[PDB]
Design a protein around this ligand. Structure first.
Ligand code: AVJ
Ligand code: CL
Ligand code: FE
Ligand code: NA
Length: 444
C-alpha cells in the first residue's frame, strides 16, 4: 500500500516528553540518518559536494552529531565535547549566492567521522538516561537543547536526501524497504477552486506545547481576500505541456534574473528529468524511472514563476497568509496523528500522484496543501511580530530576513518531526532545489 519497512516516529507534545518516549524518538532520529548515510557505497564519494551550493557529504556526516554536542554543552548538560576540532569543523553549514563563493579544508577520513558519530550517540544517550524529564519541557528548560538537536537532525535527513539524489545512481544503494509511490497515471483535470476569504492568525504562542524554531513564533492577524487556487499541485504532465510550448525558450515568461540563471545553467527542463530516446526519464531517490505524469512537478521558484508567466492572466503563487487560510481555515489544536493523513513522514519514499492519498484533501477543497512536496509561496522570508532569537542558536533565521529567500510550506514526503506540523516555516533562495513544487493562483 505505502512505505512501511522504514518507519519514522511521530513528534511528541512537550507535555508528553517522558524520558522513555524521548529515548525512542532520539534513537529513531539517529537511525534514520544512519540508514541514509549508509546508502553511499564508496567512502571516496563523501568528498563530492553533489549540489554545487552545499558542502561535501563528509560535512553532513558529522554535522548533525556535532550540533547536538555543541547545544548540550551550551546549556551545560554536557561538561565536555568529544572532539573540539570536529565540533568546530562541523559546526556551521552554508547558504552561498553562487558556487564560486563556496568553492573559495582538510576533511577527516570517513571512518574517523563515523567513529565521532558513534561516540556522540553514546554520550547523548547517557545524558538522556541520567537527566530528569520534569514535564512539561519548554523553551527555557535545558532539555530544549535536545529537542532542537533532534529536529535539526531530521531536517538534515531531508536536505541530505536531496544531495544523495544528485549523485549518480551507481554511487548509491537503495535501503531495504524504500518504496516509491505508484507512478503510472495520466493526471486528472486540475480545476480552479474558489477559496473563500477570511482572517487568519499567523504565528505560534510562546507557551504552545510543541518544540519550534524562533522564526515560528509571533502573532500576526491577516485579512485574506477570496482567491482561486488549483485543486492539485502542478503535475509533471502539466509542466511537460509548458515545455512543449517553448516555456524555457520564451523570455516574456521569465524575468532578467531568472532568465540569467536558466541560461548560466543551460536549463531545458526540471532538474531531475533527462531526455533520452524520445522520452523523459525521472530521477527518484535511487533509480531512474519513466516520468510519473501525475506526480507534482519539482521545480525551483524561478521555474514556478515562469510557468505562471506562460499561464498569463495574472497567474501567481499564494502568499503565506493565503496558504494558511487554505490549509487551516479561520480557526487551532494540532492533532499529531493527522500527519498520517498526508504524504508526510515517509508514508512514501517519493512524491505521490496528486489526489492518490484519499485523506489529503483540506476542507477548502485543495489536495496536498500538506505533504507530497513543499509548495513555494510568493513571500519573502520575514519575522512575525513578537519574534526573538533563542540564546541557543541566535543566527538560526535572522540573517535570512534579507529579501533574497522565498518561503515554502506544508512539508514533503520526506519531512519528519515538528516540521510536519502547522507552525514550521521553511525558506530557500529562489534558485535552490528541494523536494518542492507549487500550485497556481488567480485573483478572479
Ligand atoms: C530552514 N532550512 C531548511 C532552510 C535550513 C535548516 C537548517 C539546517 N541547519 C540549520 N538550519 C537550511 O537548510 O539551511
Ligand atoms: Cl493538525
Ligand atoms: Fe544544520
Ligand atoms: Na504541499
Amino acid at each position: 500500500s505505502h512505505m512501511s519497512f522504514i518507519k519514522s516516529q511521530l513528534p511528541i507534545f512537550l507535555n508528553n516528553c517522558t524520558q522513555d518516549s524521548v529515548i525512542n524518538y532520539f534513537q529513531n532520529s539517529w537511525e534514520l540518518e544512519n540508514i541514509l548515510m549508509r546508502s553511499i557505497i564508496d567512502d571516496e564519494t563523501f568528498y563530492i559536494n553533489p549540489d554545487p551550493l552545499r558542502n561535501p557529504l563528509i560535512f553532513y556526516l558529522g554535522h548533525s552529531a556535532a550540533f547536538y554536542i555543541n547545544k548540550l554543552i551550551r546549556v551545560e548538560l554536557l561538561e565536555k565535547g568529544i572532539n573540539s576540532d570536529y565540533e568546530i569543523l562541523f559546526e556551521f553549514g552554508v547558504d552561498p549566492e553562487n558556487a564560486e563563493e563556496l568553492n573559495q579544508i582538510n576533511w577527516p577520513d570517513v571512518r574517523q567521522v563515523w567513529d565521532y558519530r558513534n561516540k556522540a550517540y553514546e554520550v547523548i544517550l547517557e545524558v538522556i538516561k541520567n537527566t530528569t524529564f520534569d514535564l512539561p519541557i519548554h523553551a527555557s528548560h535545558p532539555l530544549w537543547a535536545l529537542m532542537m538537536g533532534m529536529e535539526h537532525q531530521r531536517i538534515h535527513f531531508e536536505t541530505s536526501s536531496m544531495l544523495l539524489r544528485q549523485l549518480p545512481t551507481e554511487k548509491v544503494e537503495k535501503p531495504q524497504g524504500w518504496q516509491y509511490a505508484p507512478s503510472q497515471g495520466v493526471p486528472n483535470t486540475n480545476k480552479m477552486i474558489l477559496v473563500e476569504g477570511g482572517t487568519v492568525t499567523l504565528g505560534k504562542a510562546k507557551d504552545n506545547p510543541l518544540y519550534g524554531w524562533d522564526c515560528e513564533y509571533g502573532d500576526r492577524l491577516v485579512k485574506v481576500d477570496s482567491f482561486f487556487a488549483s485543486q492539485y499541485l502542478v503535475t509533471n504532465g502539466e509542466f511537460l505541456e509548458f515545455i512543449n510550448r517553448k516555456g524555457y525558450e520564451t523570455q516574456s515568461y521569465w524575468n532578467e534574473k531568472s532568465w540569467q540563471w536558466k541560461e548560466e545553467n543551460k536549463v531545458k527542463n526540471p532538474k531531475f528529468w533527462q531526455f533520452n530516446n524520445g522520452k523523459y526519464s525521472y530521477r527518484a531517490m535511487f533509480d531512474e524511472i519513466p516520468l510519473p505524469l501525475d506526480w507534482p512537478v519539482e521545480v525551483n521558484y524561478y521555474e514556478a514563476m515562469a510557468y505562471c508567466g506562460w499561464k498569463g492572466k495574472g497567474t501567481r503563487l499564494m502568499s503565506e497568509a493565503e496558504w494558511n487560510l487554505a490549509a487551516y481555515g479561520s480557526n487551532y489544536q494540532v492533532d499529531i496523528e493527522k500527519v498520517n493523513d498526508y504524504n508526510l513522514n515517509l508514508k512514501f519514499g517519493s512524491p505521490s500522484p496528486v489526489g492518490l492519498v484519499k485523506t489529503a484533501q483540506s476542507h477548502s477543497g485543495l489536495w496536498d496543501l500538506r505533504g507530497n512536496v513543499w509548495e513555494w509561496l510568493d513571500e519573502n522570508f520575514h519575522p512575525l511580530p513578537g519574534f526573538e532569537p533563542h540564546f541557543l542558536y541566535e543566527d538560526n533565521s535572522a540573517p535570512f530576513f534579507d529579501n533574497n529567500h522565498k518561503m515554502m510550506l506544508g512539508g514533503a514526503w520526506v519531512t519528519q518531526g515538528t516540521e510536519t506540523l502547522k507552525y514550521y516555516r521553511n525558506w530557500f533562495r529562489p534558485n535552490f532545489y528541494q523536494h518542492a513544487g507549487f500550485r497556481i493562483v488567480t485573483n478572479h
